[PDB]
């Protein structure tokens, strides 16, 4: 509370590094919080003219999940400027070629369309797997919770829970499976 002016300003406008797991998580919901943190909309001291911005490191990018048939239906279109140089790549193909590109484009779209978008994008770090350099690892402060709960598989359920779950119907003995 009773700090000098320079250290108080430094503490108020200090940058923060956040961690975000991307395994079994929707790109849109990940990008929402990524954009919030990048713009600094989580800080009561936020202002458009101010340079308040926090770094976000997203891991397990290759293990991302799309709801529905977006893997097969969603497309990304680019153009090289040259005639006949317009390409439309499926989401699955784009993820196979570069896992980072999906979440990178999602965050790029969710970010505001001003000139600060490039500046806040340069603060973003995306990694396909849990292989992060120590220089970035030593800067992490906290890890944001996963926006989507990962459902359990059948084999991942414990036997006590399986037994506690009642059997709704009784199969006949004469039937064959």
């Amino acid at each position: 509370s009773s700090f000098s002016k320079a250290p108080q300003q430094w503490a108020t406008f200090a940058r923060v590094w956040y961690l975000l797991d991307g395994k079994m998580q929707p790109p849109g919901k990940l990008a929402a919080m990524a954009s919030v943190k990048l713009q600094g909309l989580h800080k009561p001291v936020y202002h458009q003219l101010s340079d308040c911005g926090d770094h976000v490191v997203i891991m397990n990018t290759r293990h991302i999940a799309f709801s529905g048939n977006k893997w097969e239906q969603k497309v990304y279109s680019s153009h090289t400027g040259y005639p006949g140089g317009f390409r439309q790549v499926t989401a699955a193909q784009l993820h196979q070629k570069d896992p980072v590109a999906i979440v990178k484009l999602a965050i790029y779209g969710m970010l505001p369309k001003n000139l600060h978008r490039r500046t806040m994008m340069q603060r973003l770090h995306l990694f396909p797997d849990e292989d992060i350099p120590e220089d970035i690892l030593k800067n992490l402060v906290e890890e944001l919770p996963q926006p989507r709960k990962v459902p359990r598989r059948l084999d991942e359920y414990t036997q006590e829970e399986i037994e506690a779950f009642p059997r709704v119907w009784s199969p006949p003995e004469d039937y064959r499976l």
Binding site: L41, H42, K43, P44, V45, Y46, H47, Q48
Partner: protein, 99 residues
Amino acid sequence: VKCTRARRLKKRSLRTLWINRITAASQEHGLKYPAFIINLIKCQVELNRKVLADLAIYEPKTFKSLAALAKRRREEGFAAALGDGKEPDGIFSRVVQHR
């Protein structure tokens, strides 16, 4: 002409900035802005967004107390709605008339 238009728009811009700051501070306490606002209103606490943003920026303890009060009011309202009982009333849900 732009000066007049921007003077008119300054109130809206500063209100939106205050709302954004309040949303930031409330989500920092794990509470949503509409719920926080409606629960603070239900507690007969007439503080505008400017004062709320100033408190969030400079009075973290006071703003956390306000957020806790709003969450308590929300929980009391939810309990009353679930119960549907006239006799059971929350401590902070009581309404005080003018004096």
